[PDB]
Amino acid sequence: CSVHAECCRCVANYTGNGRQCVAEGSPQRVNGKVKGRIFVGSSQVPVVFENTDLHSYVVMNHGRSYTAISTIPETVGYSLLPLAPIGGIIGWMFAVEQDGFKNGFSITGGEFTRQAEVTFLGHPGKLVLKQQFSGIDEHGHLTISTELEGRVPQIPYGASVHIEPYTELYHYSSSVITSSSTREYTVMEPPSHTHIYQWRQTITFQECPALPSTQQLSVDSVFVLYNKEERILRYALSNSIGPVR
């Protein structure tokens, strides 16, 4: 049990599950490592990177999370721009809660595994993602390990990418949460080009009035950026969890 919970359950002024608790309103950080094995376009030569750093800063106000993945080769940077969900999982974790609806942290305590798959329609292959979250560490920071492997279409160097607001349904059943969504994104050359991809997701965790079978996540103010100079991939978005309306 957490040093801020009773025997578990976080006491007033605090939130989370039993094993992990955080003060209400206070910002949080989610850090870890990223290993990649990505094939761009039709290429047969995969860009491999490892020991890369992921630092995440979340502000509680609007459930806004900022994710920065540093030391990303110019060879994959632009191509990874559409993959905001890599960092979006954290937005789900700390989404603004409505009436009778809890966010990911209240449900998992930051302890869980996530497996996601993405398919870009009209393009071969798919990209598989695997992440592990292990609660708060010795320095008081949440933890996250990320493993990416697969194929992604090619995006022109210097190209830009835009994502409009959207909603996602997270289904709950027996300590397992699943989600499936088809969305679109726009690519703008250094002239626009709209594209669509499909995301599938499975979240596994352990549990000690059951939870709603279905919750809706509302995402807006999304920004994805890649800087060739600093070689830093960034994803930022705001979040709200509640019922379909």
Side-chain angles (χ1 to χ4, degrees), residues 102-187:
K102 277 171 161 47
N103 56 30
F105 189 73
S106 299
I107 298 177
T108 73
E111 303 168 295
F112 67 96
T113 64
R114 172 211 194 192
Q115 59 201 68
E117 170 186 301
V118 207
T119 295
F120 296 75
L121 300 178
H123 302 282
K126 63 174 184 177
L127 173 67
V128 174
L129 163 53
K130 306 177 182 300
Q131 286 172 150
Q132 174 66 55
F133 299 69
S134 307
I136 314 181
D137 67 19
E138 181 181 60
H139 302 301
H141 302 316
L142 275 50
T143 57
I144 179 187
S145 58
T146 301
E147 169 180 349
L148 306 170
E149 197 189 309
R151 186 172 296 275
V152 148
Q154 178 179 56
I155 288 186
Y157 280 53
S160 206
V161 177
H162 187 70
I163 289 165
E164 293 286 291
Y166 66 85
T167 65
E168 283 194 304
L169 303 188
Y170 287 74
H171 302 291
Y172 170 76
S173 56
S174 301
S175 301
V176 179
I177 297 177
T178 56
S179 186
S180 192
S181 166
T182 302
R183 300 194 288 279
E184 58 197 2
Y185 62 93
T186 299
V187 181

Side-chain angles (χ1 to χ4, degrees), residues 35 42 45 52 87 137 140 144 153 183 199 220:
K35 177 179 183 175
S42 61
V45 176
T52 300
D137 67 19
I144 179 187
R183 300 194 288 279
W199 289 77
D220 74 282

Side-chain angles (χ1 to χ4, degrees), residues 8-157:
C8 323
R9 176 175 179 171
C10 312
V11 64
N13 298 59
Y14 285 67
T15 183
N17 68 336
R19 315 178 199 297
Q20 313 291 322
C21 299
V22 165
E24 303 188 313
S26 70
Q28 296 297 309
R29 291 173 170 283
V30 200
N31 311 314
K33 302 293 192 175
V34 186
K35 177 179 183 175
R37 209 305 223 303
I38 300 74
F39 295 66
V40 178
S42 61
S43 167
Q44 295 300 300
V45 176
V47 174
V48 173
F49 63 78
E50 63 296 300
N51 188 54
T52 300
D53 289 275
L54 183 164
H55 294 297
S56 203
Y57 191 69
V58 337
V59 177
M60 297 308 255
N61 196 311
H62 296 288
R64 195 164 185 63
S65 49
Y66 303 82
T67 299
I69 300 173
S70 59
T71 299
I72 290 294
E74 332 64 45
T75 40
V76 293
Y78 300 98
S79 282
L80 299 187
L81 283 174
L83 311 181
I86 290 172
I89 178 64
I90 292 157
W92 169 78
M93 286 174 64
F94 293 100
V96 179
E97 303 172 320
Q98 301 183 303
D99 45 66
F101 292 86
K102 277 171 161 47
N103 56 30
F105 189 73
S106 299
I107 298 177
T108 73
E111 303 168 295
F112 67 96
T113 64
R114 172 211 194 192
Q115 59 201 68
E117 170 186 301
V118 207
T119 295
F120 296 75
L121 300 178
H123 302 282
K126 63 174 184 177
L127 173 67
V128 174
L129 163 53
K130 306 177 182 300
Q131 286 172 150
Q132 174 66 55
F133 299 69
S134 307
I136 314 181
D137 67 19
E138 181 181 60
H139 302 301
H141 302 316
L142 275 50
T143 57
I144 179 187
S145 58
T146 301
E147 169 180 349
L148 306 170
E149 197 189 309
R151 186 172 296 275
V152 148
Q154 178 179 56
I155 288 186
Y157 280 53

